[PDB]
Amino acid sequence: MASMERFLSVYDEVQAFLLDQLQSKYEIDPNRARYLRIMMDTTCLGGKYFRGMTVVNVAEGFLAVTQHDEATKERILHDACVGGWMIEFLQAHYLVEDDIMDGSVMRRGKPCWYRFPGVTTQCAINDGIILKSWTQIMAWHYFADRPFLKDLLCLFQKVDYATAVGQMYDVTSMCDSNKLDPEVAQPMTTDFAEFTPAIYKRIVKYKTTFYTYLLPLVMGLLVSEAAASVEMNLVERVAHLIGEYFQVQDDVMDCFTPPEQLGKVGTDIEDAKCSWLAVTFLGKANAAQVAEFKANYGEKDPAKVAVVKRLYSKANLQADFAAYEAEVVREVESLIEQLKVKSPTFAESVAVVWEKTHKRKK
Amino acid sequence: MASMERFLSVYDEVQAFLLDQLQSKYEIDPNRARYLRIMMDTTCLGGKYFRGMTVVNVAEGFLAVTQHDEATKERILHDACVGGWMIEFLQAHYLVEDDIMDGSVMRRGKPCWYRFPGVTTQCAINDGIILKSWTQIMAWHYFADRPFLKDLLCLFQKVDYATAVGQMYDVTSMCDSNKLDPEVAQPMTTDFAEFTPAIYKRIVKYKTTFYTYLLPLVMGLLVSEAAASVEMNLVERVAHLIGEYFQVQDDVMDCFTPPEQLGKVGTDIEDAKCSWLAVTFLGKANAAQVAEFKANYGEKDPAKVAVVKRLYSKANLQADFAAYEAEVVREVESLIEQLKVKSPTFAESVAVVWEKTHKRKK
Numbered sequence: 247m248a249s250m251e252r253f254l255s256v257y258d259e260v261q262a263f264l265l266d267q268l269q270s271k272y273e274i275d276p277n278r279a280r281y282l283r284i285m286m287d288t289t290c291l292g293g294k295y296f297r298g299m300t301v302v303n304v305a306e307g308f309l310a311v312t313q314h315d316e317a318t319k320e321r322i323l324h325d326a327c328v329g330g331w332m333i334e335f336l337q338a339h340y341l342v343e344d345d346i347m348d349g350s351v352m353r354r355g356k357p358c359w360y361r362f363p364g365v366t367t368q369c370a371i372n373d374g375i376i377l378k379s380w381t382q383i384m385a386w387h388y389f390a391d392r393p394f395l396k397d398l399l400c401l402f403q404k405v406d407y408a409t410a411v412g413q414m415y416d417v418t419s420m421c422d423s424n425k426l427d428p429e430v431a432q433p434m435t436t437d438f439a440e441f442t443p444a445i446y447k448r449i450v451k452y453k454t455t456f457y458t459y460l461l462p463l464v465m466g467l468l469v470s471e472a473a474a475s476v477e478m479n480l481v482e483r484v485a486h487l488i489g490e491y492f493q494v495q496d497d498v499m500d501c502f503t504p505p506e507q508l509g510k511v512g513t514d515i516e517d518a519k520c521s522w523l524a525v526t527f528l529g530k531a532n533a534a535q536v537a538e539f540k541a542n543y544g545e546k547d548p549a550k551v552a553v554v555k556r557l558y559s560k561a562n563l564q565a566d567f568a569a570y571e572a573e574v575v576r577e578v579e580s581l582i583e584q585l586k587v588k589s590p591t592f593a594e595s596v597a598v599v600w601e602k603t604h605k606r607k608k
Numbered sequence: 609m610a611s612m613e614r615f616l617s618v619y620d621e622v623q624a625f626l627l628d629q630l631q632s633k634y635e636i637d638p639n640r641a642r643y644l645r646i647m648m649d650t651t652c653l654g655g656k657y658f659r660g661m662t663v664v665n666v667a668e669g670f671l672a673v674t675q676h677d678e679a680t681k682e683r684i685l686h687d688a689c690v691g692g693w694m695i696e697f698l699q700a701h702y703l704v705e706d707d708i709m710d711g712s713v714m715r716r717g718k719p720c721w722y723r724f725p726g727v728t729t730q731c732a733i734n735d736g737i738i739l740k741s742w743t744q745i746m747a748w749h750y751f752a753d754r755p756f757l758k759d760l761l762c763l764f765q766k767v768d769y770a771t772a773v774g775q776m777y778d779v780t781s782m783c784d785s786n787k788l789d790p791e792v793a794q795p796m797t798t799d800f801a802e803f804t805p806a807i808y809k810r811i812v813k814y815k816t817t818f819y820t821y822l823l824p825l826v827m828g829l830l831v832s833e834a835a836a837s838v839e840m841n842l843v844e845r846v847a848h849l850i851g852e853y854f855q856v857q858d859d860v861m862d863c864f865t866p867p868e869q870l871g872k873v874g875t876d877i878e879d880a881k882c883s884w885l886a887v888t889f890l891g892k893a894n895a896a897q898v899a900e901f902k903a904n905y906g907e908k909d910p911a912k913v914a915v916v917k918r919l920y921s922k923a924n925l926q927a928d929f930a931a932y933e934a935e936v937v938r939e940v941e942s943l944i945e946q947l948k949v950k951s952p953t954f955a956e957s958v959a960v961v962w963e964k965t966h967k968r969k970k
């Protein structure tokens with residue numbers, strides 16, 4: 247059975263289980279069940295399923311080289327699908343809440359969930375909470391008897407926490423750290439001294455890479471009972487490397503990809519985000535370019551946004567991206583080679599993840 | 609050592625652990641650590657600690673009648689305090705997010721967290737997420753070796769989910785169920801046909817009673833390794849009964865308690881909530897009273913709110929509350945008597961919880 251067919255079939259099964267349980271144990275009525283079905287579909291479906299499918303693909307790689315009864319193969323793949331959906335539902339939680347936090351308009355070509363007329367922010371915040379709860383409901387139901395339950399739950403909650411910490415790093419990335427204070431309204435930085443590679447790397451590591459790469463790779467190992475067979479320090483290092491590249495691509499696309507292809511209007515410049523573009527620009531600009539950037543960044547004024555995009559264009563940041571990408575290729579290939587010492591099979595799964603990420607539509 | 613002294617000492621210890629771990633494992637800087645310390649204090653401290661202290665008091669009751677080394681008593685009480693703080697931090701998560709959802713102004717005599725000048729909704733939504741994550745970080749750290757870890761985590765996530773489901777029941781309680789639809793803006797009910805005792809009871813059971821009574825009572829049993837010694841069906845029934853009374857008191861206070869004592873301005877009438885007052889009023893009103901209620905409920909117009917408060921006053925709902933309270937006393941005393949068959953000690957702990965709830969400042 248093709249992996250994507252299995253993954254989509256398991257979504258339907260998990261949805262039916264969750265909704266049936268709301269009826270049998272939580273006293274839900276049919277109209278509220280329908281609302282939640284629609285909310286689940288709208289917030290969880292429509293992406294590429296990169297993260298959830300990585301769990302499945304990692305598991306498939308081990309199945310190809312390990313002796314198992316057919317029923318065991320089916321169990322492992324079903325578990326990989328459920329675990330993959332846990333990650334997709336965790337992402338859905340963060341996207342619902344982030345869109346509210348940021349006042350975003352569109353996501354994946356459609357209005358953000360909170361903007362649906364019959365949702366509103368009042369309901370959407372709580373819908374996002376439900377999405378997160380569903381990750382645990384599905385784990386306890388499907389994995390109750392499994393030897394990996396404890397490790398999987400502990401990993402999951404640490405990754406969730408890291409993501410929340412990363413969201414804090416991201417939301418505060420345009421303020422001066424020494425002025426942070428709940429009592430005092432926060433002005434945007436004027437010096438941009440905290441727009442550095444190391445500070446950018448911290449934001450991305452926590453906000454993106456743990457849930458986007460580390461969690462699917464390690465969950466794939468756990469459902470395969472294979473974690474002891476790899477060097478975990480290498481898994482962490484390769485996840486953090488590929489995850490940073492993924493986010494750099496997203497940062498470039500926010501500025502330069504036409505919104506019809508992006509699925510949204512990117513607002514990183516208006517929001518004063520510490521993006522790869524801003525950090526890299528400030529790492530090559532002359533004093534006059536720095537001053538013009540300071541005079542225009544972080545403002546909704548469309549003429550000021552256009553000045554920033556022109557500064558970026560004239561600064562030939564495409565060349566910096568090419569150099570960055572070439573270095574990532576060197577480093578990822580090196581990490582894949584190291585992974586082969588203890589697990590050639592897992593190394594190939596990572597090679598596949600990297601190729602997918604590298605070839606992701608620019 | 610007095611129980612409250614121990615509980616407050618454990619807060620300081622847990623806070624230090626969480627913040628130290630953010631520095632050692634999550635790359636946090638000192639200013640963001642200070643923000644989170646202040647956020648923790650502002651959102652988690654200042655209440656009565658009814659819920660967290662119930663874990664401690666349940667554990668103390670078993671210690672008084674069970675043979676243990678002194679070091680074991682200290683471990684159990686420390687565990688009860690940590691578990692109690694998990695509940696307090698879960699509540700803090702829901703209060704942060706609920707205040708945003710509802711546009712609330714004040715909580716416990718101070719501005720709601722999102723209204724602090726240097727917080728804002730963008731940060732506060734995520735701060736609430738962090739509060740929830742901290743409940744799991746503390747459990748995995750302090751309870752890693754404990755036999756009750758699995759049961760406690762599974763209970764906790766089910767209660768969290770129930771609370772989210774109850775929030776959905778509460779937020780939608782003023783709309784007609786058959787019109788719920790994410791695509792269509794939701795009008796307030798005109799018939800109020802869903803303002804019934806059974807529908808009210810469903811809202812309260814899920815939104816309040818699981819986290820306010822069931823979770824502290826059962827967590828106290830788990831940290832005491834005593835759950836097998838009680839009839840759990842009775843624990844559920846007594847939690848749901850006392851929890852409903854707690855919420856009825858809160859509903860009355862929202863309308864009639866001066867805001868200086870309440871700590872906020874109650875807005876249930878303007879928000880069209882399915883409150884005990886509204887349900888009970890509609891259960892005794894004549895046609896003219898129903899019509900005037902319909903003409904004024906659910907509107908910010910202060911003159912319309914005053915009409916509703918006068919309808920409530922003239923309807924002698926104080927007498928309905930007295931009758932409701934007398935029935936709760938009958939039923940809670942009956943459940944405490946039944947609890948004595950298998951656990952006289954736990955029965956006394958419940959009797960203490962009931963007395964505290966019954967005597968809670970009106």
Ligand SMILES: O=[N+]([O-])c1ccc(O)cc1
Pocket residue numbers: 296297300458459462492599601602603604606
């Ligand atoms: O972009 N990609 O191709 C991805 C992204 C995440 C992941 O876990 C695997 C592949």
Ligand SMILES: O=[N+]([O-])c1ccc(O)cc1
Pocket residue numbers: 658659662820821824854961963964965966968
């Ligand atoms: O109001 N009260 O006294 C309470 C409330 C909750 C609880 O778990 C114990 C006592």
Ligand SMILES: [Zn+2]
Pocket residue numbers: 344347348416
């Ligand atoms: Zn964001």
Ligand SMILES: [Zn+2]
Pocket residue numbers: 496497500
């Ligand atoms: Zn982006």
Ligand SMILES: [Zn+2]
Pocket residue numbers: 706709710778
């Ligand atoms: Zn509310």
Ligand SMILES: [Zn+2]
Pocket residue numbers: 858859862
């Ligand atoms: Zn209330």
